[PDB]
């Protein structure tokens, strides 16, 4: 049931999503090893992901969380980068999309920094980089990230390096 609707670059929704992407780039401690060396992106396309069943699944859980947390879903917009991006948009997030070895246990990980999610686009550690050139810092190949609506509810705070 998924359809993708292109946003025009003139559209203010395009512009605000692009600004969140660009403005949350930072330098990483691997010096670019996983995700490449860059200070900004060339944005080629932004598309709205529409799937009624997946949206209703999300809003249903959101309501449950909110009723467990004094009517506060604690909803954020966050980035996700994944080799499985094409299955996520058609079938939704599930346990197949979890970072089993992540530092907070087996769950599905999201970032405020777009450049952190960019490190997982070709796999954990950036995998072997782009399929065409095997280059984790490929400047040619087109990458995709998700900008996702995420219900955190009552979040457990873990201080960490």
């Amino acid at each position: 049931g998924t359809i993708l609707i292109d946003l025009s670059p003139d559209d203010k929704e395009f512009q605000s999503v692009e600004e969140e992407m660009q403005s949350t780039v930072r330098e990483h401690r691997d010096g670019g090893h996983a995700g490449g060396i860059f200070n900004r992106y060339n944005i080629l396309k932004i598309q709205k992901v529409c799937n009624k069943k997946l949206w209703e699944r999300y809003t249903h859980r959101r309501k449950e969380v909110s009723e467990e947390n004094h009517n506060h879903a604690n909803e954020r917009m966050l980035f996700h980068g994944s080799p499985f991006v094409n299955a996520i948009i058609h079938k939704g997030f599930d346990e197949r999309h979890a970072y089993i070895g992540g530092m907070f246990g087996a769950g599905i990980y999201f970032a405020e920094n777009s450049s952190k999610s960019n490190q997982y686009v070709y796999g954990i550690g950036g995998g072997t980089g782009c399929p065409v050139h095997k280059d984790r810092s490929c400047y040619i190949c087109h990458r995709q990230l998700l900008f996702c609506r995420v219900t955190l509810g009552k979040s457990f705070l873990q201080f960490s390096a």
């Binding site: 330098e27 907070f104 246990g105 599905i108 952190k116 900008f147 955190l152």
Partner: protein
Amino acid sequence: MAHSPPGHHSVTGRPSVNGLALAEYVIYRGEQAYPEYLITYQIMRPE
């Protein structure tokens, strides 16, 4: 997939060394996220 710590719905990883880093978050049920925008891009070589 693991479970949220008892009484919580997610985990927040607060950056605690690198003062430039923003937070990262984990959810333990797929239904707590909706993939709203698909962004196609290239990273750009610094000049």
